[PDB]
Amino acid sequence: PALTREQLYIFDTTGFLVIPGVFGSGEVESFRSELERLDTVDPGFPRTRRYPDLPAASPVFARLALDDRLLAPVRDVVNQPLRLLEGYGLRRTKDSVLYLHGGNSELLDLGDRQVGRDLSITHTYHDGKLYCPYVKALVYLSDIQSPEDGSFCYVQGSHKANFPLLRERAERGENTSLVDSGFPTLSDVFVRSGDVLLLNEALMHGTRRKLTEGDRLLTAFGYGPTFFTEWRELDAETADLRGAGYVDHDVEEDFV
Amino acid sequence: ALTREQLYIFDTTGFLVIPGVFGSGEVESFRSELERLDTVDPGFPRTRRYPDLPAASPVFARLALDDRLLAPVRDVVNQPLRLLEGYGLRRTKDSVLYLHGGNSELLDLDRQVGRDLSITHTYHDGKLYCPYVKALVYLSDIQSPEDGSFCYVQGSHKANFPLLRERAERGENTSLVDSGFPTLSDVFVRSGDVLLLNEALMHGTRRKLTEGDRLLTAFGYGPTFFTEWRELDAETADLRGAGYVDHDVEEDFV
Amino acid sequence: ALTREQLYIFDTTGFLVIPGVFGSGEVESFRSELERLDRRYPDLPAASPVFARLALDDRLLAPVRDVVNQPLRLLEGYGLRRTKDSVLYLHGGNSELLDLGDRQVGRDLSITHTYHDGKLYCPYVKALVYLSDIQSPEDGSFCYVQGSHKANFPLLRERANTSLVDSGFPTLSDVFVRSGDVLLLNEALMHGTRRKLTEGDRLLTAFGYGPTFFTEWRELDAETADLRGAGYVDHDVEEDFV
Amino acid sequence: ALTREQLYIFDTTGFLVIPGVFGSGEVESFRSELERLDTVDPGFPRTRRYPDLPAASPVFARLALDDRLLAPVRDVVNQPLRLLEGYGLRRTKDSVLYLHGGNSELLDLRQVGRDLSITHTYHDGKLYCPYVKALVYLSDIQSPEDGSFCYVQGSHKANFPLLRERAERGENTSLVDSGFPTLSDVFVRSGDVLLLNEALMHGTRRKLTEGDRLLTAFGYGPTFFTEWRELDAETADLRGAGYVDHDVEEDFV
Numbered sequence A: 001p002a003l004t005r006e007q008l009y010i011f012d013t014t015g016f017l018v019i020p021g022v023f024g025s026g027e028v029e030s031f032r033s034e035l036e037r038l039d040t041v042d043p044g045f046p047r048t049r050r051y052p053d054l055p056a057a058s059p060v061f062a063r064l065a066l067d068d069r070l071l072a073p074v075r076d077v078v079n080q081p082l083r084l085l086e087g088y089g090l091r092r093t094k095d096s097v098l099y100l101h102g103g104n105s106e107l108l109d110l111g112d113r114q115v116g117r118d119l120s121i122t123h124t125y126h127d128g129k130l131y132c133p134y135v136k137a138l139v140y141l142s143d144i145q146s147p148e149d150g151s152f153c154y155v156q157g158s159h160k161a162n163f164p165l166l167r168e169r170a171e172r173g174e175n176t177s178l179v180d181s182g183f184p185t186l187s188d189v190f191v192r193s194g195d196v197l198l199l200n201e202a203l204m205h206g207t208r209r210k211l212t213e214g215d216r217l218l219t220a221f222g223y224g225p226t227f228f229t230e231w232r233e234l235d236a237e238t239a240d241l242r243g244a245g246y247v248d249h250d251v252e253e254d255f256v
Numbered sequence B: 001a002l003t004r005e006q007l008y009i010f011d012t013t014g015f016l017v018i019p020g021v022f023g024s025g026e027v028e029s030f031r032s033e034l035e036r037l038d039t040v041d042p043g044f045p046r047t048r049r050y051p052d053l054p055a056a057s058p059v060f061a062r063l064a065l066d067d068r069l070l071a072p073v074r075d076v077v078n079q080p081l082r083l084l085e086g087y088g089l090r091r092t093k094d095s096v097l098y099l100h101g102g103n104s105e106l107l108d109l110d111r112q113v114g115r116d117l118s119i120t121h122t123y124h125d126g127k128l129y130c131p132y133v134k135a136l137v138y139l140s141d142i143q144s145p146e147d148g149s150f151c152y153v154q155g156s157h158k159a160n161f162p163l164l165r166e167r168a169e170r171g172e173n174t175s176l177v178d179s180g181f182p183t184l185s186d187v188f189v190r191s192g193d194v195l196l197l198n199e200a201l202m203h204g205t206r207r208k209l210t211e212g213d214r215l216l217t218a219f220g221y222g223p224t225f226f227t228e229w230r231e232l233d234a235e236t237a238d239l240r241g242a243g244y245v246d247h248d249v250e251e252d253f254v
Numbered sequence C: 001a002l003t004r005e006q007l008y009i010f011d012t013t014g015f016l017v018i019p020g021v022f023g024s025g026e027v028e029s030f031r032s033e034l035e036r037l038d039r040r041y042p043d044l045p046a047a048s049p050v051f052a053r054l055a056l057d058d059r060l061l062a063p064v065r066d067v068v069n070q071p072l073r074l075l076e077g078y079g080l081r082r083t084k085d086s087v088l089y090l091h092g093g094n095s096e097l098l099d100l101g102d103r104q105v106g107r108d109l110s111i112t113h114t115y116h117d118g119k120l121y122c123p124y125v126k127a128l129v130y131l132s133d134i135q136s137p138e139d140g141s142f143c144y145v146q147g148s149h150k151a152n153f154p155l156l157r158e159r160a161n162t163s164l165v166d167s168g169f170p171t172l173s174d175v176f177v178r179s180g181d182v183l184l185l186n187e188a189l190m191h192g193t194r195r196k197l198t199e200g201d202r203l204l205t206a207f208g209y210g211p212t213f214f215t216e217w218r219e220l221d222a223e224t225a226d227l228r229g230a231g232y233v234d235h236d237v238e239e240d241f242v
Numbered sequence D: 001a002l003t004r005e006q007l008y009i010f011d012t013t014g015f016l017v018i019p020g021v022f023g024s025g026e027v028e029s030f031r032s033e034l035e036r037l038d039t040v041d042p043g044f045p046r047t048r049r050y051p052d053l054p055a056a057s058p059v060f061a062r063l064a065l066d067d068r069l070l071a072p073v074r075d076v077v078n079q080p081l082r083l084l085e086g087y088g089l090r091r092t093k094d095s096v097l098y099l100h101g102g103n104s105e106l107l108d109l110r111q112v113g114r115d116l117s118i119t120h121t122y123h124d125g126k127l128y129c130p131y132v133k134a135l136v137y138l139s140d141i142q143s144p145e146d147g148s149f150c151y152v153q154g155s156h157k158a159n160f161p162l163l164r165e166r167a168e169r170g171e172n173t174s175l176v177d178s179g180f181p182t183l184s185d186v187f188v189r190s191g192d193v194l195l196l197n198e199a200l201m202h203g204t205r206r207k208l209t210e211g212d213r214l215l216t217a218f219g220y221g222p223t224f225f226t227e228w229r230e231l232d233a234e235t236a237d238l239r240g241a242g243y244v245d246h247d248v249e250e251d252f253v
């Protein structure tokens, strides 16, 4: 089914939505086992690792990327001809962290000028519909019920912020992450296996430092309009203007 | 770089004519190069299209990267820049270009949408952010409507209401470029002029009735995460389909 | 009530000419009542039951409702008479600047407008009811800067000696009206009139409407020291340096 | 004045708690003055409004014009400023304040989903909020049972209406009592100022404890806004001034 009125209200106002129990106990086990099989095929990765391009690596994840349980809520917040921009898995262990990234008005130095909009996450609303160009559906494969489990955390209302947060911090001499220091509007989200966290990538977000033992697991699928390119990092515009990909604005990794 | 006045004009009108950007010798050399390149039939009568001019010619590969085009474009896109298309158009007697673009035109998916995020533009802290702009380099004089003059609906780049759906539903058969419309206006240009265009603007050209060849080369720019321009009919079943699905355009019903 | 096309036009241009709203009979009544008040005619409603009825006429109210879409009140009602060599320099504009004495601002919330779910929300609109034909520039035609009602950069601060109304501007356009036409106007629009050089009286009545929480129009020079000041501090206008 | 982080926070959450604005002495005199107004009638303190504090008391007339209120207010309104509202509030046991405000709540005139008295924007480094309120707390509120200020997250920039669907479906209980996933509580110390974008959908929890809870509220807006006055609808002759609220919980709870 489609997103209810209350769910749209929440995604609009908070920049994300947890849809509980989307995938059952059995499907979740099947997703975990498929990641274990990928470890067997190509051994020798670090224990904290990324699983790039899952739909190509596994027909199980190719189906999950097109599963209507993801696509229907995704269509409801994107409302454009839809394209799969990326699909990857994340395995994390003790002492891993993910610093804050995203945020609506963070700065980027554009050679001869500095800009405070990123049109890959700049979203709007029109005649009863959200239009968010880059959203992500995070399918959790393990329970994350405490901050020391490495819980997803986010800065309240940062998906619609008009002021930059991180440039001031970098030029101030800061060298620690807000996910460690704390911030008056930084909040945690707890989830179960099989939950989907539907995310406006405009939202400034990250995770806490994982302190507990055990493998923290998810699969992430990014979607946007058919005219966006598949996700690829790009350090800068290239001189012949044929460079393609995504140039991040200020993120905590730049100075933490 | 664009002046304050020029920025104001582009923001308020959706476009800017920059007069005499290229000299008469540079124009002639662009014209000469167009005389020997291959064209395709684009589907409009009495129109030839030069597809992918930067690929087919070193002359236009450089023009596409010429700072006389890039500096104004950068000032209205203000994102890491990518070249999305470069093409030429040649037109004779009795050719026409019906209205396309427009900020709030509808697209049916099941659901009906009235935003096209490929042309949805904004403003923030002293800068314009338009994701799809075109630099139109005119290689011929267009001084009267009967020359097939560029025309546009005023303020259509920031319109909040759809214009063309109602027209198709009420049985309209003819294009506003022929009919007329109280806010449809003409732009006249000289050879060597650049027209910098916000693609959210609803625009086209009058029907050309004069002899001679109407000539221009168009270069489209957008952010680095935009795909190179290619029409797409609809999203594909495996969601791997790449391209631009247009909204209502007069060609759908005129 | 406005048609869909009419709303598109009001949205995209910042104004709308509705032709022949009032018949020649009613226009003559309005002209006579203005002769009797003998330049600007303040508070026409409180001075005349004719204009008090006009301010509430539904040929004015219904299009006004379609662009304010808030609980309404009448904020001002005045008449204007002009002869030759009279001129109205440019005022209005979405992003014109104002100094508050410790900072400079580029928004005027009295005219800052928006759109939501099929409806326009313009906090200040004027219905200008014309009582004389204005068919050429030298008649003192209404003129406006295209798209200025949605402008994001200021225009008049940078150039601040002559008025754009005289020298010209690439997007300054003219509007022609017949007697009995209504010019419905978004006050965010930067506008004025050409210099009148012709003979004969130029006559109109203007009614401004806004939300019930807006105060009646009076020009305030600045915020008072006790924060009890009531009224409208205008932003950069041409007559500040012309 | 407001720091950059403070401006960021006001923008993103619709409010800002500025701690320790007023000292213990000042708070006592404010409290003292509200009790002086209580003395007009015999009997115990009752949940009530104290209208027009600036006119009622020289102390509160000065409070309304104090720079510790105006400087932050100015940083979020950025217009020629006008005092729109000045009142005191006493809350006792069993008192409650249901959700009101909200950026896209509906109003039947046709049905409209914008209230231009709270419709705020941003332009070239500055916030523009037409109606903001400085709440000066005269009591500690450190738990929900004390009747803590509560707000629906991000509701100052909501594009969807929340309350119309609840009313039309027969709901008769306030979110404040039932809870809501994005309804959160704000705790304050005596002397704290809560600076508030009135676009925010907010209220307080039901106060379940004894003791009394006091505050003084000052509302500000541009000079072309009228002083606050409830309006039910537009008057017959379009001459009436006032504020017509959109859907609030009081309408149906």
Ligand SMILES: O=C(O)CCC(=O)C(=O)O
Residues within 6 Å of the ligand: A090, A098, A138, A151, A152, A205, A206, A207, A218, A220
């Ligand atoms: O691990 C998470 O919970 C979020 C991960 C994330 O935001 C990302 O992969 O970009």
Ligand SMILES: O=C(O)CCC(=O)C(=O)O
Residues within 6 Å of the ligand: B089, B097, B136, B149, B150, B203, B204, B205, B216, B218
């Ligand atoms: O021919 C012109 O003048 C404009 C052409 C155009 O707008 C287009 O190629 O889409």
Ligand SMILES: O=C(O)CCC(=O)C(=O)O
Residues within 6 Å of the ligand: C080, C088, C128, C141, C142, C191, C192, C193, C204, C206
């Ligand atoms: O004279 C006109 O046509 C318009 C006058 C005007 O804009 C005004 O009265 O504020």
Ligand SMILES: O=C(O)CCC(=O)C(=O)O
Residues within 6 Å of the ligand: D089, D097, D135, D148, D149, D202, D203, D204, D215, D217
């Ligand atoms: O009592 C409170 O904490 C809030 C009161 C309030 O929102 C109001 O008076 O408008």
Ligand SMILES: [Cs+]
Residues within 6 Å of the ligand: B246, B247, B252
């Ligand atoms: Cs189409």
Ligand SMILES: [Cs+]
Residues within 6 Å of the ligand: C234, C235, C240
């Ligand atoms: Cs002034």
Ligand SMILES: [Cs+]
Residues within 6 Å of the ligand: D245, D246, D247, D251
């Ligand atoms: Cs009400």
Ligand code: NI
Residues within 6 Å of the ligand: A101, A205, A206
């Ligand atoms: Ni992320």
Ligand code: NI
Residues within 6 Å of the ligand: B100, B203
């Ligand atoms: Ni075109």
Ligand code: NI
Residues within 6 Å of the ligand: C091, C191, C192
């Ligand atoms: Ni005017």
Ligand code: NI
Residues within 6 Å of the ligand: D100, D202
């Ligand atoms: Ni309140």
